[PDB]
Amino acid sequence: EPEPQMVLSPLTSAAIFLVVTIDSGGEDTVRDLLSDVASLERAVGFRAQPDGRLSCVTGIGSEAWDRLFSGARPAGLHPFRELDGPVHRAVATPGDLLFHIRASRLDLCFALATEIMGRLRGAVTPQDEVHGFKYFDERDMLGFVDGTENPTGAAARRAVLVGAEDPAFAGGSYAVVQKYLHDIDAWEGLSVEAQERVIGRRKMTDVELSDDVKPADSHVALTSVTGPDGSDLEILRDNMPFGSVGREEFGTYFIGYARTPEVTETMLERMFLGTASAPHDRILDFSTAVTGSLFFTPAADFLEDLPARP
Amino acid sequence: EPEPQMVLSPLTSAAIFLVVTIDSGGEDTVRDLLSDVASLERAVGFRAQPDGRLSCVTGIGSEAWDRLFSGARPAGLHPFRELDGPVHRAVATPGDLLFHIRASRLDLCFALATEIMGRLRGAVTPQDEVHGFKYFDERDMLGFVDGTENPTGAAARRAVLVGAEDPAFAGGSYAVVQKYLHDIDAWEGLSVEAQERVIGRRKMTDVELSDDVKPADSHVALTSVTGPDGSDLEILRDNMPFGSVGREEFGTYFIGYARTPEVTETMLERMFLGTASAPHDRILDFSTAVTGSLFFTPAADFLEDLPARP
Ligand code: HEM
Ligand code: HEM
Numbered sequence A, B: 001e002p003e004p005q006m007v008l009s010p011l012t013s014a015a016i017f018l019v020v021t022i023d024s025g026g027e028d029t030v031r032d033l034l035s036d037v038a039s040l041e042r043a044v045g046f047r048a049q050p051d052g053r054l055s056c057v058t059g060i061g062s063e064a065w066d067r068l069f070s071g072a073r074p075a076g077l078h079p080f081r082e083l084d085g086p087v088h089r090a091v092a093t094p095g096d097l098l099f100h101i102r103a104s105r106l107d108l109c110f111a112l113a114t115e116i117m118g119r120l121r122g123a124v125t126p127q128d129e130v131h132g133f134k135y136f137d138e139r140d141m142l143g144f145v146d147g148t149e150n151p152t153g154a155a156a157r158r159a160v161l162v163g164a165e166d167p168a169f170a171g172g173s174y175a176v177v178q179k180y181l182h183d184i185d186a187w188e189g190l191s192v193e194a195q196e197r198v199i200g201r202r203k204m205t206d207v208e209l210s211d212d213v214k215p216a217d218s219h220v221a222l223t224s225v226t227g228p229d230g231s232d233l234e235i236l237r238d239n240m241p242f243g244s245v246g247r248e249e250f251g252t253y254f255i256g257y258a259r260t261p262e263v264t265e266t267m268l269e270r271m272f273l274g275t276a277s278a279p280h281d282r283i284l285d286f287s288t289a290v291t292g293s294l295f296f297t298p299a300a301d302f303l304e305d306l307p308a309r310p
């Protein structure tokens, strides 16, 4: 009986990512928005349903949580753990609140972000805002199909949603975000055969590389992680391309939901710190991370009925 | 039997507007892109047909025209005439090339814009770049249905496409652009009735105010122009909203196609300078123009078989 937010969304061609920090003494204005946000989603979204598919997933940062809520905390909620790799850095940037707004059209996402930020105006300071558009064939900014091996339906739920491990917050999830910028000129200089050695899948056909062709330092290889037993651990990603052409900004907005942050964090360490037979993820030779933050996205039940302020 | 560019488009949800200036000695690269731009449009767009609806209207500024082409000039091509009215100013800004990119998906626009700019790189300098989205019910940032009294088909061609009057350039058109930003706060503080007296049509039903009622300083009244004969003088507009919710920007991007700049320019004068019967367009009390430029968008034929350089 707890309802989670729309962490498992259908395919949606548009998205707006909003990350803000809570000003001095903006705690109260925020908690009012947190209650209404579900209702607000419904207002912007209900006409233009069922095509629209407008949703919002709201996330709360580690430190912001303590300023906002009394009572117990989510089990594994900390601030984003910065990774200072030998070559590549996973930076950690400020964010107190996350709004993951998605729809089938960008104007719906825009209308709902306007409502959210309108009532938050004066209590929060914008940190990041990016509008994402999906390609007509699910490909990302590097030209590869993006999202293929995402857990689906029932296993997705089990991989993403808090359960009996933290009963107090079952139905919530942990969201990790990173805004990446690509060296498109560099990447496109590569042969397609060389690019597939980077990702770990065939570009066009989207078939994964056989176990002994797939390089140890390819993306798909490093992001496959298993548990201490004979079973593999997965996350839910909804990557969204973005960019400004004039500024030569070509991006991938990464977002990854998981039952516990330790899964996503493992994958991050393998990509940036590398393993024994892999100095790092080759995707990083073409992708530079300019922000990263960690949030708990609660059950929608938690937002309707908040705890008293600490 | 000269084919115009896709000035008359279907209805498109997405748009990118590019304005660049041409650097010293960039003229040659620019010409090479102009010759290939229709080609590139096909390249990006065909594999998305029919539903893609991707198109690019390419336009050239008055000064850039003499740097690029020998031979005849279009009869009406001058720089955007700055208007310095009693209250409001229509700024004139830098711009040599216009790329009016439209499709049903924002990603189709982004992709063509990437190819174009990649070619133009090293030879031009970005001046303006707006990504526009259209609301599901064809409304703009002011919440009024935008585009209702636009001309259609036969009447539109007659209104927009250069004819026998300037034969060397039949199939062309003159485009005027202005990026507008709105005092959204001010605007939303009016009553719906108040707002309708600003626009000249009823907000929610899009019926035009009757003659007696419609204020003489309302937007529709001021942009309703007749010639030296009885009949009306029309233009084709494809206004697009754009915005950033974080830095509190809510805008309309104006683009106005006409058979001769004179019609558009006349309207712009009544709006910013006034009338016997009105100080200025009431719409300007909520909208600030931040860019202005005038371009000639040649026949498709012209770009593919370019004149010699001078
Ligand atoms: C610029 C950033 C990124 C790009 C362009 C990108 C792109 C891709 C692509 C093309 C695939 C192909 C296979 C598939 O979609 O199933 C993939 C898979 C995957 N990615 Fe990434 N990705 C990015 C960042 C990340 C990050 C930061 C993580 C952090 C955990 C991550 C985790 C994964 C996982 C777990 C898979 C599937 C693993 C499997 O095949 O079992 N990705 N990504
Ligand atoms: C802030 C910028 C602007 C906004 C928000 C805006 C919006 C609108 C709206 C809501 C209408 C209602 C009627 C219709 O859609 O046909 C309209 C009509 C019109 N506008 Fe604008 N517009 C803007 C700028 C301009 C500019 C710069 C011109 C320059 C000539 C212009 C010329 C016209 C014309 C000719 C009509 C229709 C006239 C008729 O009813 O016969 N507009 N606009």
Ligand code: NI
Pocket: A280, A281, A282, A285
């Ligand atoms: Ni490397």
